[PDB]
């Protein structure tokens, strides 16, 4: 079997990516973030607690002849900004993009913090790292990547991620028309649960490239590129009046600014991020201060390669017996 699903920019920023998927029967479509990065499949609902619900679809279990209380289980779990939800369990058919899973858990919120709240357009999460970082207990459930797995023709998903434009997850093949040139596989470690690989360097506009060894994550539930202290003070150097901003949260620059690409090495491939990809607007509506799409890890424990970097390329996730990531231009 397979699977294709087009994901969307939430705004016109390219915050976040929604995808609809349906869940129960009858079906139930909601707009899911998918998130590399995580590995629970959470949704607001009808045990959301009603004040934290402003505008999400939400999924009703007892209007689903398919779904079945998880009995005991309970999940809870936060995110990179400080975010978090929790709940309880049911068990349903899940199905994104024509492909079906049968007995999905799917993680009912009945507490979701603020962020969540306030973004109408995100109904919850599908996580796609390692089921060994699911959050439910006591017992540990099954990503839909690792349900679906057995029944793929490949067991891989894709991602091409659009910039300021539409995209798409397809899952068990690889669409040989939607990169150019060759797609470059490089070895992960599932060790921390995550997509964690090496990339093999960058280089700043038409700079020369840098050979170093950067280990990371490949992370579409976040959205910005996230890196060394030394690299990322490399990049915003070759931008006039860039500076980090304590106050703001990171690097800022001035919306004047015309910004220079930046390459991340795949082996001896390389990916280019455009200039304007790394462009995140205004820091409030109206200011001439515009945030930045690369910022540093420091403090963060890891780097993350998000939706900035991945929206470059058509990425790979390889979940054979020794998974792999692949990189090709597009
Ligand atoms: N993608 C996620 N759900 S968490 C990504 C992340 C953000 C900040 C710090 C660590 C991580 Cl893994």
Redesign the pocket.
């Given at each position: 079997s397979t699977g294709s699903a087009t994901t969307t920019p939430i705004d016109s920023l390219d915050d976040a990516y929604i995808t609809p998927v349906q869940i129960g029967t009858p079906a139930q479509t909601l707009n899911l973030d998918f998130?590399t990065?995580?590995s629970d499949l959470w949704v607001f609902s009808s045990e959301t607690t009603a004040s934290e619900v402003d505008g999400q679809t939400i999924y009703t279990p007892s209007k689903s002849t398919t779904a079945k209380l998880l009995s005991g289980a309970t999940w809870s779990i936060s995110?990179?900004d400080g975010s978090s939800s929790s709940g309880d369990v049911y068990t349903d058919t899940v199905s994104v993009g024509g492909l079906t899973v049968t007995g999905q858990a799917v993680e009912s919120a009945k507490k979701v913090s603020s962020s969540f709240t306030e973004d109408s357009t995100i109904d919850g999460l599908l996580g796609l790292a390692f089921s060994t970082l699911n959050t439910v207990s006591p017992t540990q459930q099954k990503t839909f990547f690792d349900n679906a797995k057995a029944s793929l023709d490949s067991p891989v998903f894709t991602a091409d991620l659009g910039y300021h434009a539409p995209g798409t997850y397809n899952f068990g093949f690889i669409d040989t028309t939607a990169y150019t040139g060759s797609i470059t596989y490089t070895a992960v470690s599932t060790k921390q649960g995550?997509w964690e690989w090496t990339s093999t360097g960058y280089a700043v506009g038409s700079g020369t490239f840098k050979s170093t060894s950067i280990d990371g994550?490949a992370?579409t539930?976040?959205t910005l590129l996230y890196l060394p202290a030394t690299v990322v003070s490399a990049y915003w150097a070759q931008v006039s009046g860039a500076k980090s901003s304590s106050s703001v949260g990171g690097y800022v620059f001035p919306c004047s600014a015309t910004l220079p690409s930046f390459t991340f090495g795949v082996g001896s491939a390389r990916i280019v991020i455009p200039g304007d990809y790394i462009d995140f607007g205004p820091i409030s509506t109206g200011s001439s201060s515009c945030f930045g799409g690369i910022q540093s890890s420091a403090g963060?424990?890891?780097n993350?390669f998000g939706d900035v970097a991945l929206k470059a390329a058509f990425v790979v996730f390889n979940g054979a017996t020794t998974p792999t990531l692949g990189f090709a231009s597009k």
């Open positions: 998130d990065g995580s995110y990179g995550f994550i992370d539930g976040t963060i424990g890891i993350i």
